[PDB]
Amino acid sequence: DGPQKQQLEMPLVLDQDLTQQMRLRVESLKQRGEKKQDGEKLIRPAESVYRLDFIQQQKLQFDHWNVVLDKPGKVTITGTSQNWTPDLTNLMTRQLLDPAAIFWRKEDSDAMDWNEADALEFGERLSDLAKIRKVMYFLITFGEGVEPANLKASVVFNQL
């Protein structure tokens, strides 16, 4: 908009503990032979839980994503209802957001690509979801050839 605005880049960091929580849960149901909680969303092996901590709940405007990969691959960052307390609820399929920001990189080059229109729609939303709580949770789906160790995934906001 304007080349003048202060920007704050906030990293989506790997949430190893809850990722595992979720990983053990899908087990459990296996060893127990119990079914899920009706509309419960079970973390697949290909997904990993990421965390985003909002440094300034207010005055965040969202500006652009800053996601890049090490190898050619694909990733999908599906947001999560800010009403989901991983301390309390079990993530419900319905708690996932629409849409998701899908990013990918093709073989020969280094240039990142994504689903623009959607990555922007989902984006403009973080500026408000920030005012709900200082913690945002996401579920990243890794393609083939990609694993957590190839990704940088911060979100750049504008300071109002």
Ligand SMILES: C[As](C)(=O)[O-]
């Ligand atoms: C300067 As802008 C269009 O990335 O909010």
Ligand SMILES: C[As](C)(=O)[O-]
């Ligand atoms: C889901 As937790 C163990 O980071 O409060």
Ligand SMILES: C[As](C)(=O)[O-]
């Ligand atoms: C071809 As696929 C949708 O199983 O990564």
Ligand SMILES: [Zn+2]
């Ligand atoms: Zn944690």
Ligand SMILES: [Zn+2]
């Ligand atoms: Zn679960």
Ligand SMILES: [Zn+2]
């Ligand atoms: Zn902007």
Ligand SMILES: [Zn+2]
């Ligand atoms: Zn592909």
Ligand SMILES: [Zn+2]
């Ligand atoms: Zn917790």
Ligand SMILES: [Zn+2]
């Ligand atoms: Zn849609």
Ligand SMILES: [Zn+2]
């Ligand atoms: Zn494109």
Ligand SMILES: [Zn+2]
């Ligand atoms: Zn779409």
Ligand SMILES: [Zn+2]
């Ligand atoms: Zn818009």
Ligand SMILES: [Zn+2]
């Ligand atoms: Zn819109």
Ligand SMILES: [Zn+2]
């Ligand atoms: Zn896959």
Ligand SMILES: [Zn+2]
């Ligand atoms: Zn695939």
Ligand SMILES: [Zn+2]
């Ligand atoms: Zn393929």
